[PDB]
Design a protein around this ligand. Structure first.
Ligand code: ZN
Ligand code: ZN
Lengths: 329, 329
């Protein structure tokens, strides 16, 4: 069996549907050619997309071709709405999470969905998380930060702890990338800022001592192999050993906390995957493709399948780990 | 023989010396206890430092203890002065580069120095680079960016090309880190922003096509193992294969340009070093410690010496590569 736990969808939202929330910032889908289409914002074009992003039937055909039995899918991060007024964002989140379940309803045995939450208000976010999971979502996908609040911020740690106590799994996705006016060309935000964003989120939890407070029951996974986290961990441990301000809130070597989280396998390179599995363990890396975006893996699972990891490790990564992490059969 | 090509010094600058340039932004050294001291700016304390940073005699004692035969050293990046008026910055650069040669004069067989340049004015920077090297410097150390100008910017590429045509080697050091108002605690700028800064500098050259224009004669090295560059290269190659805007200026797979630059070995982890050498080749990684700072390597060369790389590879990394790169015996 083969599970892909990192992929995205975008629902068939009309311009008028979106305008009832926000004419300028609520995204919607314009479908033409329906082979091609575009995530729209207001009247401006936001991003060109193709049919698998919005069409569960077409998607199942590609999944069959790729040999993917079960795909876990979740919002495109442009849908997050973290800057909106909280109550409007919560209404948006519930509408998007209902759309997701409608997408999955096409074939709920093979399409699983994770939900978004109005993270700018802890109470509303906790309530939508429980509501979405009760309605059929297998967990939540959040952005890695909320403006200048990183995951060490008590509000975000409290959302994680809520999910832990309710056995709700979390996928953390980089979004709203740092960088200012730099990285204008060649998709540098996706190549530089995204992996740094995810590393920052992981280190924000470790170095703030959040894992000393969050129950071990938390199931939390970081996208894109955890960014650069695994490769730069030796530098973190060395800093921790030599500067008291790095130890202030983190009572043991930072690298020891890798038993508290998961990463997907999307590192697009054999040696990077081997290092990732070295650092994280064969039990904490899960096949994820970033389907259907261009910077995802074209042959889903190809990197893991063609690796020199043992047959046992390949089975956990392509199926066993996500089956346990998301409660899939 | 053993060469450490990444280390820093700070000269015995008095408050009045610095005030003749800028009472508020020119750094200086306050030496007390002389065991301890502090890089000062204006009347405010900037960073606590210890004696090896400013004392060549004391430094030689530690080098003897560590088994370091030759150390290459260069400005502490707070000395760069890239925001200053250009002519004042050029006068500062020449004074700092003279101090560096005075530091090295204590034992020029075992202490080599690289120079700083007033990078905010290409003509003055090119002139100081040639002048410093003529006076005895073995190359130049620059910051990785100049404000919102990264290394793809024609002015910085032109400085690199000048050095290439004059056989002047370059060390590129992360500095003035991205991140805005985030990363306030646990030295996250050094752990997250610095490796991303260096990755951004390397990718700025590759993805802009600068290596198609800069002569192959350029000898250029990136600090801290090149940041996260080597681990995230598979993600870059995949993006390049699937988005035309990533290929616009870079006519072949980005990973093929690793034969155009060097990195130091300071990745503080055995598996990271093995991956680094895999990506870069045993001929393009050089032992560097970041001495004498806390986030440097305590036992200089310990990671390389205790590795499972071949005896031949260990010899290139700890001695042969830098001997050739800097023209040392
Ligand atoms: Zn994604
Ligand atoms: Zn340094």
């Amino acid at each position: 069996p083969r599970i892909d736990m990192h992929s995205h969808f975008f629902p068939r939202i009309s311009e008028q549907e979106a305008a009832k929330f926000d004419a300028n910032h609520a995204p919607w889908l314009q479908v033409s050619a329906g082979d091609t289409g575009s995530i729209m914002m207001g009247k401006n074009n936001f991003r060109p997309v193709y049919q698998a992003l919005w069409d569960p039937a077409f998607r199942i055909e590609e999944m069959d071709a790729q040999g993917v039995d079960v795909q876990v899918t979740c919002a495109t991060p442009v849908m997050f709405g973290y800057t909106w007024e909280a109550n409007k964002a919560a209404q948006w989140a519930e509408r998007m999470n209902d759309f997701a379940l409608e997408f999955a309803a096409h074939n709920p045995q093979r399409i699983k969905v994770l939900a978004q939450v109005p993270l700018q208000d802890l109470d509303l976010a906790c309530k939508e998380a429980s509501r979405a999971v009760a309605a059929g979502h297998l967990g939540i996908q959040i952005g890695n930060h909320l403006g200048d609040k990183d995951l060490d911020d008590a509000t975000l740690e409290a959302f994680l702890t809520h999910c832990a106590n309710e056995d709700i799994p979390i996928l953390v996705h980089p979004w709203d990338m740092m960088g200012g006016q730099r990285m204008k060309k060649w998709m540098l935000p996706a190549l530089v800022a995204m992996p740094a964003e995810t590393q920052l989120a992981i280190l924000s939890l470790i170095l703030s001592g959040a894992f000393e407070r969050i129950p071990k029951s938390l199931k939390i996974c970081f996208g894109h192999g955890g960014g650069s986290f695994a490769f730069l961990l030796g530098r973190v441990d060395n800093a921790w050993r030599h500067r008291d301000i790095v130890r202030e809130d983190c009572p043991r070597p930072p690298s020891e906390y890798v038993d508290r989280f998961f990463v997907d396998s999307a590192v697009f390179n054999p040696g990077a995957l081997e290092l990732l599995v070295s650092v994280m363990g064969e039990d904490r890396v899960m096949l994820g493709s970033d389907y259907p975006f261009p910077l995802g893996e074209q042959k889903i699972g190809g990197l893991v399948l063609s690796s020199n990891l043992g047959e046992s490790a390949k089975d956990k990564i392509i199926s066993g780990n996500a089956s346990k992490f998301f409660n899939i059969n």
